[PDB]
């Protein structure tokens, strides 16, 4: 309840600079890659085997898994710079802009811009531009650099709206059986974005494009964390609005999917991360 | 110093029954799969990216990474039955047999026998025969059943010998740069099996065949843990013989390979598991 996570639009130029520096430091030491890999491994970890669900997506653990992911990542930033916390990208607000690509989050001072079509959409601007930031493929081998292609697909030509967020917050049930891509009247599946997909969470990944548009490579793009800090914020809000409500399933959904089950690749359980304040952080506002 | 890890050949009928029983429960609960996944993930995690070294093999962390692996595995077994510890398969003595496939380790009440040529070398005997034990391919999808083909390979027709172990124990250095498959006069690379490969550990893997023969699927076979328990034991012996020799590299090795670096997929470091006695276990003898 001490660490404050801020809206990207509220950061001082120094905070932006420090965040970028710390990320680049984590990347140099080899710590950043551990994060890419954890998310990759989890994505291929089906619960149960053969099922469409995995440890981090298309199921109940989607939200708590990423919260732990972000928590661990933020603790790593703190180790380098104690004054650095994870900021959140409020995409619902950027969706209101005439041209979202002009949002300050994409400035050459922060995340860098959209991909360059003349270069097969390689990001050639910002601190994570090809040549300054190496990426790796799902195979785990060096790739050719970050790629982004804002709103190119037909299913995600735009960022989700404030209304989409509001409608999701309306759901009274955290999740509902079978606890997967098909769960109905489920806040979790709603936020994740499988209802009339792609929506919200899923839609943002698709809108961004490049490595961000697919599970095995998503974290190669630093914005992955700003996105999920926002997703984590929507959830924190949901938890306040419906305080009558608790995580689901409690038992008898799939192993690694239940309230007290370990979340591959960690021993962390959903219960362990239900209270973000106990985890040591809050969102401005 | 309380948990004793025993030679498979020193186990009672009951101790073997309980070990197998506990492994099945671990499997049934979904815990066993986490281990197959962890080992697979580590094998694809190169240190550094593009390199030939990975978090669990072909470099210095090979030994401490597997020691941590077994420790975690033994703790889970202990959680199911506090009287069960990890036994070790002393293959160097089995190598002396006229026909090693006749060793009591392969009895039907234990691990099971060799694969069935008619079935495409699917294991049809023992507690883990196809139909009684599910397996998972490199993709994380169900694979249809355990396979074994003892010494079918021209490269590893025989199990390593006592002489092979003894010679490795004479090595003075834990490891040597470049800290990878080419390291010379390295106890680690020797025990792993790359000096005139396939030797030792690498040779046991190749000799067993089936999922045990390849990195991404090896742990699917329970004997993987019995194998690595002996490898761990051989290392523990080396540690006592060369009491003034320590882990290498101490620093400036690839991140993930140094004495105090975290070992993907965990935060555990080689330092953390250098003394097995501190880990709560010892070998019988
Ligand atoms: Cl603020
Ligand atoms: Cl909140
Ligand atoms: Cl909250
Ligand atoms: Cl504020
Ligand atoms: Cl004994
Ligand atoms: Cl003994
Ligand atoms: Cu993802
Ligand atoms: Cu995501
Ligand atoms: Cu091995
Ligand atoms: Cu291995
Ligand atoms: Zn809150
Ligand atoms: Zn944690
Ligand atoms: Zn603010
Ligand atoms: Zn590879
Ligand atoms: Zn010892
Ligand atoms: Zn010595
Ligand atoms: Zn004994």
Contacts of B61 in chain A (CB under 8 A): none
Determine the Cα–Cα distance for residues B228 and B69; give it in Å rounded to an integer: 9
Q: Smallest Cα–Cα separation from B228: which of B46, B65, B80, B79?
A: B65
At residue B203, φ and ψ (nearest 5 deg) are -70, -35
The bound ligand whose nearest atom lies closest to the alpha carbon of A203 is: 8
Q: Is the dihedral of CA A45, A51, A56, A60 positive or negative?
A: negative
* Residue A141 contacts B, CB cutoff 8 Å: yes
- The resolution, in Å, is 2.0
CA Rg value for chain B: 18
Contact A123, A130 (CB under 8 A): yes
Query: Which CATH number describes the domain made up of A1-285?
Result: 1.10.1280.10
* Residue A136 contacts B, CB cutoff 8 Å: yes
Determine the Cα–Cα distance for residues A75 and A78; give it in Å rounded to an integer: 5
Determine the Cα–Cα distance for residues B23 and B166; give it in Å rounded to an integer: 32
Residues with CB under 5 A from ligand 13 (ion): A 6-7, 10, 284
Q: What is the 3-state secondary structure (H, E, C) of chain B?
A: CCEEECEHHHCCHHHHHHHHHHHHHHHHHCHHHHHHHHHHHHHHCECCCCCCCECCCCCCCHHHHHHHHHHHHHHHHHHHCCCCCCCECCHHHHCCCCCHHHCHHHCCCCCCCCCEHHHCCECCCCCCCCCCCCCECCCCCECCCCECCCCCCCCCCCCCCHHHHHHHHCCCCCCCCCCCCCCCCCHHHHHHCCCCCCCHHHHHHHHHCHHHHCCCCHHHCCHHHHHHHHHHHHHHHHHHHCCCCCCCCCCCCCCCCCCCCCCCCCCCCCHHHCCHHHHCEEECC
Q: Which of B26, B37, B133 to mutate to test the interface with A (most CBs of A within 10 A)?
A: B37
Residue B146: HSE in the Cβ half-sphere, 13 Å Cα cutoff: 27
Interhelix angle for B223-241 vs B162-169, to 10°? 40
Q: Tell me if B50 and A264 make a contact (CB, 8 A cut-off).
A: no
Eight-class DSSP state of A280: T
Determine the Cα–Cα distance for residues A183 and B271; give it in Å rounded to an integer: 45
Token pair 């030797």 is found at: B199
Residues 6+ apart with CB under 8 A from A246: A174, A259, A274
User: In the numeric block, which tokens belong to residue B218?
Assistant: 């090896």
The bound ligand whose nearest atom lies closest to the alpha carbon of B185 is: 16
Q: Is the dihedral of CA B177, B183, B187, B192 positive or negative?
A: positive
Distance (Å) from the alpha carbon of A64 to chain B's nearest alpha carbon: 18
Q: Which of A30, A65, A260 to mutate to test the interface with B (most CBs of B within 10 A)?
A: A30
Chain A residue with the nearest C-alpha to that of B141: A50
* Residue B260 contacts A, CB cutoff 8 Å: no
The b-or-e profile of B50-76 (16+ CB within 10 A means b, else e) is: eeebbbbbbbbbbbbbbbbbbbebbeb
Contact A172, A78 (CB under 8 A): no
Distance (Å) from the alpha carbon of A49 to chain B's nearest alpha carbon: 6
Sort B188 into a burial class: Cβ within 10 Å, 0-12 / 13-18 / 19+: buried
Nearest neighbour of A49 by CB, restricted to B31, B48, B142: B142
Chain B residue with the nearest C-alpha to that of A51: B141
Determine the Cα–Cα distance for residues B160 and B207; give it in Å rounded to an integer: 9
- Residue A247, helix vs strand vs coil: coil
**β partners of residue B136:** B142
Contact A233, A240 (CB under 8 A): no
* Residue B255 contacts A, CB cutoff 8 Å: yes
Sort A147 into a burial class: Cβ within 10 Å, 0-12 / 13-18 / 19+: buried
For A41, A149, B19, B105, the CA distances from A57, given in Å and listed in that order, are 12, 23, 34, 40
CA A91 from chain centre, in angstroms, equals 12
B116-125 LR contacts (CB < 8 Å, sep 24+):
B120/B147, B121/B147, B121/B148, B121/B149, B121/B209, B121/B210, B122/B146, B122/B147, B123/B147, B123/B148, B123/B210
Q: Where are the alpha helices (DSSP H) in chain A?
A: 13-29, 31-44, 62-80, 91-94, 162-170, 187-192, 200-208, 223-241
Nearest neighbour of B256 by CB, restricted to A30, A40, A50: A30
Separation of A272 CA from ligand 12 center, angstroms?
8
Contact A177, A253 (CB under 8 A): yes
Contact B206, B156 (CB under 8 A): yes
The answer, yes or no, to whether the previous bond of B157 is cis (omega within 30 of 0) is no
Q: Smallest Cα–Cα separation from A102: which of A24, A159, A22?
A: A159
Sort A242 into a burial class: Cβ within 10 Å, 0-12 / 13-18 / 19+: middle
Q: Smallest Cα–Cα separation from B231: which of B258, B204, B197?
A: B204
- Residue A92, helix vs strand vs coil: helix
Residue A20: HSE in the Cβ half-sphere, 13 Å Cα cutoff: 22
Considering all CA atoms of chain B, what is the largest pairwise distance in Å, rounded to the nearest integer? Answer: 53
Sort B238 into a burial class: Cβ within 10 Å, 0-12 / 13-18 / 19+: buried
Contact B61, B273 (CB under 8 A): no
Pairing outcome for strands A3-5 and A281-283: parallel
Q: Tell me if A265 and B265 make a contact (CB, 8 A cut-off).
A: yes
Contact B136, B211 (CB under 8 A): no
* Residue A35 contacts B, CB cutoff 8 Å: no
Separation of A125 CA from ligand 1 center, angstroms?
26
Token pair 């106890």 is found at: B187
**β partners of residue B116:** B122
Nearest neighbour of A37 by CB, restricted to B41, B48, B50: B41
Contact B78, B84 (CB under 8 A): yes
Q: Tell me if A142 and B255 make a contact (CB, 8 A cut-off).
A: no
Separation of A76 CA from ligand 11 center, angstroms?
22
Determine the Cα–Cα distance for residues A271 and A274; give it in Å rounded to an integer: 5
Distance (Å) from the alpha carbon of A249 to chain B's nearest alpha carbon: 16
Q: Tell me if A45 and B264 make a contact (CB, 8 A cut-off).
A: no
Residues 6+ apart with CB under 8 A from B114: B101, B106, B121, B123, B148, B149, B150
Chain B residue with the nearest C-alpha to that of A136: B49
Determine the Cα–Cα distance for residues A182 and B245; give it in Å rounded to an integer: 57
The b-or-e profile of A45-68 (16+ CB within 10 A means b, else e) is: bbbebebebbbbbbbbbbbbbbbb
Cβ atoms within 10 Å, residue B172:
11
For A194, A226, B242, the CA distances from A136, given in Å and listed in that order, are 27, 20, 40
User: In the numeric block, which tokens belong to residue A194?
Assistant: 């499988």
Contact B94, B88 (CB under 8 A): no
End-to-end CA distance of chain A: 12
Residues with CB under 5 A from ligand 15 (ion): B 236
């Amino acid at each position: 309840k001490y660490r404050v996570r801020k809206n990207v639009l509220h950061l001082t130029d120094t905070e932006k600079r420090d965040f970028v520096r710390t990320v680049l430091i984590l990347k140099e030491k080899g710590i950043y890659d551990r994060y890419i890999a954890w998310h990759g491994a989890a994505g291929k970890f089906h619960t149960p085997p053969g099922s469409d669900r995995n440890a981090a997506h298309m199921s109940s653990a989607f939200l708590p898994w990423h919260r732990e992911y972000l928590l661990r990542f933020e603790r790593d930033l703190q180790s380098i710079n104690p004054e650095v916390t994870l900021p959140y990208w409020e995409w619902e607000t950027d969706a209101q802009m005439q041209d979202p690509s002009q949002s300050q989050i994409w400035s050459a001072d922060f995340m860098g811009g959209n991909g360059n079509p003349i270069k097969d959409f390689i990001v050639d601007t910002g601190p994570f531009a090809a040549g300054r930031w190496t990426t790796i493929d799902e195979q785990g081998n060096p790739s050719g650099g970050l790629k982004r292609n804002f709103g190119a697909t037909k299913e995600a030509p735009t960022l989700p709206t404030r209304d989409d967020v509001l409608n999701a917050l309306k759901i009274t049930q955290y999740d509902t059986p079978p606890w997967d891509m098909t769960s109905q009247n489920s806040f979790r599946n709603q936020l994740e974005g499988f209802i009339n997909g792609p929506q919200l969470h899923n839609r943002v990944h698709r809108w961004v494009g490049g490595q961000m548009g697919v599970v095995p490579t998503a974290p190669n793009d630093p914005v992955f964390f700003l996105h999920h800090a926002n997703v984590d914020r929507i959830w924190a809000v949901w938890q306040i609005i419906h305080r009558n409500q608790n995580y689901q399933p409690m038992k008898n959904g799939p192993f690694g999917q239940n309230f007290r089950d370990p979340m591959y690749p960690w021993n962390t359980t959903p219960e362990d991360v239900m209270n973000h304040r106990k985890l040591g952080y809050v969102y401005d506002i």
